[PDB]
Amino acid sequence: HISLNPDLANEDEVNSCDYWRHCAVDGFLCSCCGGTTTTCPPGSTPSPISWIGTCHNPHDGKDYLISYHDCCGKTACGRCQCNTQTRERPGYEFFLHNDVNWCMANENSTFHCTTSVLVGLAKN
């Protein structure tokens, strides 16, 4: 429960690169940028595409599928930069790769911030 619901948790955490679900994040955490883990800061637009991966939840011991969507269309937030790389792979496994701008297909591709959206339990 608590470990899956960042809006109820301590902001300091959620805003940390060590927060369990931020395990393959390259960019500024949206929750530090006037948004939350699952809401873009005002006036920035979610990416329809993202890199993906699983992260281990050390509270409940389960592995979860994460979609690392960006928020787009505003210039760089500049806050809470992370560069975590758990299970990240190069561009020949494109949807596991985080050295590309996942805003690339947005109406405006300027990168604002990135986040970690919980899809559900890892597939088994």
Binding site: T39, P42, S44
Partner: protein, 360 residues
């Protein structure tokens, strides 16, 4: 389980919000406005403002106005100077207003981008380098007037006691008052007598603005006033900020948006530093001095925290100061300001902070 969504509004009420205009001088094509909650230091959002943006919030609190310059390819191609209207709560772009390609490019003094008291017109400084004041009709989304009467003058000081009147500081050391009609065109104008000597006692452009009068401080620590309780502005001064002990250590004002006025008390706040001499007028504050403008005497002095710019909120009795990167929040409900908090890293290179208007 979760879906990332957009379309959200700023999370804190308007009354908590401040606007830190970050020039980002090292990367001045990516200037922006950072929105913060002054009560807790939380970052709330931002508005991109391209090259050397200027910003203000509409007097009714509903919109943010920016002024900027674009080029088709940034460093080449056709120039577009604009005002943009943005929603204040959604921080989204709504409208572009075309300007002639001469909007002032410069540091963020308040007086370069202002509005009439009634909020119906934006009043902005041009430099081509010839100076004039541009008028934008917000409702129509149009540039409607170019005040060439203001050639050789600089900056816009709105008159808070009239709906569409403002003053500018002219090359003669006097003030030009412009009264706009309901169409945004000049309806009348007047020129004051000389207030200050341009050569001998230059003033800082930043006003300490009351409802019916404005005070200005000089490079040498004098104070001048412009009373606009009537149609004709009456000017006076100097009186000195300095007593004999102050003069002995060469205290003078310094900064950018360096003064403010608390209207209910008449207290004027001024950034000061010792060892003044030619070339020190933009030095960071060693102290903030608190002056009683009625008695023309200092009542308090506090550490300045290397501040350069300030702004005042009348109704909550607050002063913000800004050192280029950090914002200090002060309670000024009593004559000695009380430091409440410091917001660190609010900007990389900001000389202007403003409160969200709450006064309607």
């Amino acid at each position: 389980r979760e879906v990332l969504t957009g379309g959200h509004s700023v999370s804190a009420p308007q009354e908590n919000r401040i606007y830190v205009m970050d020039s980002v001088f090292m990367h001045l094509t990516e200037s922006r406005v950072h929105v913060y909650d002054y009560t807790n230091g939380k970052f709330l959002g931002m508005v991109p403002t391209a090259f050397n943006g200027h910003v203000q919030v509409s007097n009714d609190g509903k919109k943010i106005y920016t002024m900027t310059t674009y080029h088709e390819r940034i460093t080449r191609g056709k120039r577009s100077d604009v005002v943009e209207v943005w929603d204040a709560d959604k921080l989204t772009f709504e409208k572009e207003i075309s300007l002639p390609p001469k909007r002032v490019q410069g540091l963020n003094y308040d007086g370069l981008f202002r509005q009439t008291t009634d909020g119906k017109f934006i009043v902005l400084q041009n430099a081509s380098p010839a100076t004039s004041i541009g008028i934008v009709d917000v409702a129509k989304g149009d540039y409607v007037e170019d005040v060439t009467a203001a050639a050789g003058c600089w900056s816009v000081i709105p008159q808070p006691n009239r709906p569409r009147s403002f003053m500018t500081i002219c090359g003669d050391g006097g003030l030009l008052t412009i009264n706009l009609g309901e169409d945004g065109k000049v309806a009348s104008q007047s020129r004051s007598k000389q207030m200050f000597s341009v050569a001998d006692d230059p003033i800082f452009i930043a006003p300490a603005l009351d409802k019916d009068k404005a005070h200005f401080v000089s490079y040498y620590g004098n104070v001048y006033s412009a009373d606009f309780s009537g149609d004709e502005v009456k000017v006076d001064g100097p009186w000195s900020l300095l007593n004999d002990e102050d003069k002995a250590k060469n205290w003078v004002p310094g900064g950018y948006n360096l003064v403010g006025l608390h209207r209910a008390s008449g207290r004027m706040y001024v950034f000061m530093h010792p060892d003044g001499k030619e070339g020190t007028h933009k030095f960071p504050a060693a102290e903030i001095w608190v002056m009683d403008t009625k008695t023309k005497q200092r009542v308090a002095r506090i550490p300045g925290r290397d501040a350069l710019s300030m702004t005042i909120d009348q109704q909550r009795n607050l002063m913000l100061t800004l050192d280029g990167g950090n914002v200090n929040v002060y309670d000024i409900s009593q004559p000695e300001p009380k430091l409440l908090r410091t917001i660190e890293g609010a900007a990389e290179a900001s000389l202007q902070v403003q409160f969200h208007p709450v006064g309607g």
